[PDB]
């Protein structure tokens, strides 16, 4: 047999260390296309070790990820099943479903709108995307692909899969907080349709796990340097609907995040505005608003 075909046998056996030693070999010719195709099968069968090795030999995730390849990764019933079906039904009906209905990138985008809640108005519902989607139904290659893989493994419940795409990516703190909001709200919809409590507790464990992976991420950032840590917290994220780590965290309800020291100092420095007095506050601010002469004796930041 040819080693692409023998790889798909290894994918089944789930014997990844035999696959990385013999299937992967010096001079072993991989016909162009089969390597990416085996990557797609590895995602949908939840072979997180196999995607770790197939990016180790290099699949160049930017180049693999395409609008239709990711779309097939959204419609594959193969692998661990999900709750997305139900979640799309909510969204289709609220805007206005046959079982053969093949879901869409824009269609899950409006779902993301429903559970993340408030704003989080994703790129999939930005008008620029709806015209590329209209035109097609490295332009079609998603810019920071690892984000799109995170939202997927969060919606289709795939945990050891998801934690992999978290470490390998960027916008790290943001990705954790978004994962926390997306898991918690899916956990709400689990109990809202009051289905099996197995999915409701599992998503709520997961909302806690992807939850803590934010707070010690911030905690040890504070140990690195105080300044750049705050620069992270207030960093404007275009990919996460032009908002901040504080805004996502309060939308997710992650008190520990808005209670760790670094965020609190930021908040206290906003209650100062562009003045620096503190000390006996409360009384000194009242004396300033009643005596416009008396503000001339209070210090100001440079």
């Amino acid at each position: 047999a040819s080693a692409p075909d023998q790889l798909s046998l290894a994918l089944a056996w789930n014997r990844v260390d035999i696959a990385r030693s013999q299937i992967f070999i010096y001079g072993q010719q991989w016909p162009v296309g089969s390597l990416e195709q085996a990557m797609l099968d590895a995602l949908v069968l939840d072979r997180v070790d196999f995607v770790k090795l197939l990016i180790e030999n290099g699949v160049s995730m930017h180049r693999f990820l395409t609008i239709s390849r990711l779309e097939e990764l959204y419609n594959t019933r193969h692998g661990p099943s999900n709750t997305l079906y139900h979640l799309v039904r909510d969204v289709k009906k609220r805007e206005y479903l046959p079982p053969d209905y093949r879901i869409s990138l824009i269609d899950i985008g409006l779902v993301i709108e429903y559970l993340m809640g408030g704003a989080y108005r994703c790129n999939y519902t930005r008008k620029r995307f709806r015209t590329l989607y209209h035109n097609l139904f490295e332009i079609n290659h998603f810019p920071f692909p690892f984000h799109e893989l995170m939202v997927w493994a969060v919606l289709m419940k795939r945990q050891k899969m998801a934690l992999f795409f978290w470490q390998h990516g960027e916008e790290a703190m943001a990705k954790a907080l978004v994962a926390c909001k997306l898991c918690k709200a899916m956990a709400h919809e689990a109990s809202e349709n009051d289905m099996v409590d197995d999915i409701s507790q599992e998503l709520n464990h997961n909302s806690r796990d992807f939850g803590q992976l934010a707070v010690e991420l911030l905690d040890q950032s504070y140990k690195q340097d105080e300044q750049l840590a705050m620069k992270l917290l207030t960093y404007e994220l275009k990919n996460w609907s032009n908002a901040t780590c504080l805004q996502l965290a309060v939308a997710a309800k992650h008190r520990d995040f808005i209670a760790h020291t670094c965020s609190q100092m930021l908040l206290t420095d906003m209650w100062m505005g562009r003045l620096r007095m503190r000390k006996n506050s409360g009384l000194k601010v009242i004396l300033g608003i009643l005596l416009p002469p008396s503000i001339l004796s209070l210090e100001f930041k440079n």
């Binding site: 010096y26 001079g27 180790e56 030999n57 290099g58 160049s60």
Partner: protein, 335 residues
């Protein structure tokens, strides 16, 4: 041919009749394969070039600040094996010294021998947070595998970890941060990198780093195993000017073990008894297999090396990392 290449694959002057052409392949390597992706910038340099141009390149054209240490990794050229814990304590001590001094690691570069232990040492020090350490390699051009892949001006060329088990060409180590490729015009022949590496290590030690607490830039060499040429390069550094101290890392055999068995029993250099010296030549000519006709000459080199014992620091495993020995030799060879 004499250059080792194919008879139709064409296109020093002694028997190779070379002509001195301008350089053409320099740029950046995208390391696909071998786990993490690492960018490593490479320049082909002729073996008879001036060292100050490479210094100007490495300072300004490479954005590399001058280090406080030059840990060289001269070792066995063929592939060998070690104890697992010995390789672990070796790698941990090497990366710890590399962070504490901000050193440049002058590893050989082709993935065979002690270079493979240095690349495994960088696997322990993930270095995904501080890879500034210029793990600058000095390997010859004619020996690297897929020479056609690395042709290209300022081009980020793909370089897979494809290493054919029967090919004479050796792939480079994928986890080095930089590369210097010594081109003498031939293919598949050693010795094209040695003298250039000697003059650049002397030219780095020529520079007085801004501190110069002891003096200059302090260079310390590490030896693990090696041929009789490791005893010879030990004779090079151990009686050099200014005499450069060397940790002869033990527990490994070949040259370093014979040097250690000399150094533990040498006293004032030539003050070794005949008794163990006989068993020495037995192991020098039987265990390391180097014929006795030159093992008498290995007596005279070993005892001339113990004439300056002090700089040759031993290390043993059994906590107690090699960075103790590296910093100890760093404080010995500083004046």
């Amino acid at each position: 041919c004499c250059c080792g290449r194919l008879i139709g694959q064409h296109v020093w002057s002694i028997s190779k009749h070379t002509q001195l052409s301008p350089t053409d392949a320099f740029g950046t390597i995208e390391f696909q394969g071998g786990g993490h992706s690492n960018k490593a910038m490479y320049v082909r340099v002729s073996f008879d070039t001036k060292p100050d141009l490479l210094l100007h390149l490495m300072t300004k054209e490479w954005q590399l600040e001058l280090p406080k240490l030059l840990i060289s990794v001269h070792g066995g050229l063929q592939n060998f094996e070690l104890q697992p814990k010995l390789k672990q304590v070796f790698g941990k001590g090497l990366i710890k010294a590399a962070m504490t001094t901000g050193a440049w690691i002058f590893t050989g570069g082709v993935n065979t021998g002690v270079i493979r232990h240095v690349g495994d040492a960088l696997k322990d020090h993930a270095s995904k947070s501080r890879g500034k350490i210029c793990t600058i390699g000095i390997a010859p051009w004619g020996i690297v595998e897929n020479q056609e892949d690395l042709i290209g001006r300022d081009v980020v060329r793909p370089y897979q970890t494809m290493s054919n088990p029967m090919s004479k060409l050796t792939v480079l180590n994928s986890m080095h941060s930089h590369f210097i490729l010594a081109d003498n015009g031939t293919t598949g022949k050693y010795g094209a990198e040695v003298k250039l590496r000697r003059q650049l290590e002397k030219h780095i030690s020529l520079q007085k780093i801004n501190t110069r607490i002891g003096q200059g830039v302090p260079v310390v060499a590490l030896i693990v195993e090696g041929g009789p040429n490791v005893i010879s390069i030990v004779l090079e550094y151990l009686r050099d000017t200014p005499p450069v101290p060397v940790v002869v890392c033990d527990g490994s055999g070949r040259a370093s073990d014979i040097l250690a068995f000399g150094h533990k029993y040498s006293e004032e250099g030539g003050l070794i008894n005949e008794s163990l010296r006989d068993q020495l030549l037995v192991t020098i000519q039987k265990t390391f297999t180097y014929t006795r006709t030159q093992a008498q000459h290995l007596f005279i080199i070993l005892m001339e090396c113990m004439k300056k014992k002090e700089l040759i620091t031993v290390f043993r495993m059994g906590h107690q990392d090699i960075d103790l020995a590296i910093l100890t030799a760093l404080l010995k060879g500083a004046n």
